[PDB]
Amino acid sequence: LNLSPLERSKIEKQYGGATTLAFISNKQNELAQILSRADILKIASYDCAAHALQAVLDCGPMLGKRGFSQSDIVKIAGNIGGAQALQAVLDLESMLGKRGFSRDDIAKMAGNIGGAQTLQAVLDLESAFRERGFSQADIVKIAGNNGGAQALYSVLDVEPTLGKRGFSRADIVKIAGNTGGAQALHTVLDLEPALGKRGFSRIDIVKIAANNGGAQALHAVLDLGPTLRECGFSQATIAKIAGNIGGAQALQMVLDLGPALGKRGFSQATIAKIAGNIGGAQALQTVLDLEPALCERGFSQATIAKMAGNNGGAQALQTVLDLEPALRKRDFRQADIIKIAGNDGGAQALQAVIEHGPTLRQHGFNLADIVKMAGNIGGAQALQAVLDLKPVLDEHGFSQPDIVKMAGNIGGAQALQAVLSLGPALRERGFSQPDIVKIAGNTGGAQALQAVLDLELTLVEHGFSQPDIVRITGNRGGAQALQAVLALELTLRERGFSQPDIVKIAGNSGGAQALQAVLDLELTFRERGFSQADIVKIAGNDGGTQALHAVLDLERMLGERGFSRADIVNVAGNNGGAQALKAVLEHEATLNERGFSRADIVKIAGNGGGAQALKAVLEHEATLDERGFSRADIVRIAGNGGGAQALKAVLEHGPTLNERGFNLTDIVEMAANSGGAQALKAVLEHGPTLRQRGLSLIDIVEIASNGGAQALKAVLKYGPVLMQAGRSNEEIVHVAARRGGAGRIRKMVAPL
């Protein structure tokens, strides 16, 4: 073929290169029958390639007939000693085939330097290995990386001893599989007894030895270990540090750099963490080298330690030092830079921001959006995915906030890709685009989308609706929850649970566990006096699993303290139920002391955020008592959703309202509904205005108590217009002072 002067002169430099070029020219037709152009040039890129190419002509045709690819031929011939290796294959492929070695295995082994001797060694030792329980695949791994005959004999020599010392064949092959793995095996044999007495397990030894530089790592543990232990490092830490590639160097760096790092303020736990990742040695060194400059840029010590404590920690620090100026120019604050760099692969994320940031801005994303998308593990791939998929994202009709939402989580890149791949399919199934964004919009969203597509038909056929499915998979862990529904549906319904019960239990985060927990704990619940309906109520919220267990762990003490089964259910059966149930047991004696009945306690704790409501009563009951509020007033105020906030509102705004003419009874009335806090604040801020316009305090109390803040704002907004139209205060109050008062006001004001 037409070789450029570059392709030519590359070959000429090789020993016997001029002959190789000549051979190719003089034998171009013959070679073209067996190999492509690229195959020829690859083989030609080695010394004495003329011998190898001649061997291709002499062996190639037969090897083609015998099942060897062009790729295998190149692997064998394209190496030092390739001519000999290719001949060896042709002479031995048949016998090797008999022994259960595939074409691929034969080519792999022969692909080693001096592969001809590798193959002969295998034939000589195959029966020995087979007798000892090893497979053909093990032999290939042992022979790999130019292990050759020596690696095979090394394994045979040490195996029976390592066997007696409690090492598996899998451990042995794993260690042997690396470069210098045979030497690693001998090192294991020599050092294992001392390692064991120092306190290291077989597993730690195998793990340390099964990396490149493993033998050196084993030596480092024994020789550096004692000094590290004197420096306060445990054997578990030493093993973990040594357990990664470059483990030996990392241990030495802890020893060498440790003292100077501590004197700068870094703890030993921090030093160990930085060292315990791959590239820990470089990270430790980079900290010592770059910490002064980073501090001179303003980064705190804890910040530096955190960036270094992740995988790629060394790159993170270096990239942060390099990119920080340009990032700051783009008005990134230091905290944002830190957020982006403080994860695994932070360096790549920073570089992604620099590279893609400008384009992202032009697409409408702001700094916060970029920081959110890049500020996760895999942040670099998320930003990249956004730019690459943007035209398709635009076509499908996804908004920019939709993009930020499903890309702004861990796994965001995969979420975007999954939504473009599975989206149209799900829309044809009947799922809306906003529901698709919801499902894709959590970590694991890619799997959640797939789960829906896979299970939708079956679940619908069983009586579940598509909105039910959206509800179940629209949370974190959504795929698992849906899978749990499919798996456990039969059992739950056989036990007497309805499909809406199942949906409710599964329809919250942690739903997979909640479903299983209901199955596991139902019998125990019925025995302790609870009903199936109670179980659904308790498990049917966020943290339902913890709520159920909290019931089982606390029901005895609570019952003995005068709380009924119904009381327990009402307390535990809301969001944060486990905390509310615990708070009751913690404060019931003190609350009783302050004049609150069992029923009072249940009422206060029996709403969402019941624990905080209890806490708020204890913290404020004394002051409220002093001001003239009765125990019953306090219970009414705190005994609704948001009771803690309502209680605080009375505490903070009450006197002012009282100064203005509002009596305590009215204050209690305005506050003793859900959203009572908003009501009081609405009266505080807008009350004087309504009063100026001609509304009495009584009117204001009526509206605030029965219509809430919503109704007040509606009267504030539309009141003047209605008055000009001839409506009296009696009419406006009647219209507004009701649930939905805002809507009734709007209806009356409409024609104006």
Author numbering: 15 to 766
Could you share sentences copied from the article?
In a search for putative DNA-binding domains, BurrH, a protein that recognizes a 19 bp DNA target, was identified. Here, its apo and DNA-bound crystal structures are reported, revealing a central region containing 19 repeats of a helix–loop–helix modular domain (BurrH domain; BuD), which identifies the DNA target by a single residue-to-nucleotide code, thus facilitating its redesign for gene targeting. We identified BurrH in Burkholderia rhizoxinica, a symbiotic bacterium found in the cytosol of Rhizopus microspores. Each BuD repeat is composed of 33 residues, only eight of which are strictly conserved between the repeats.
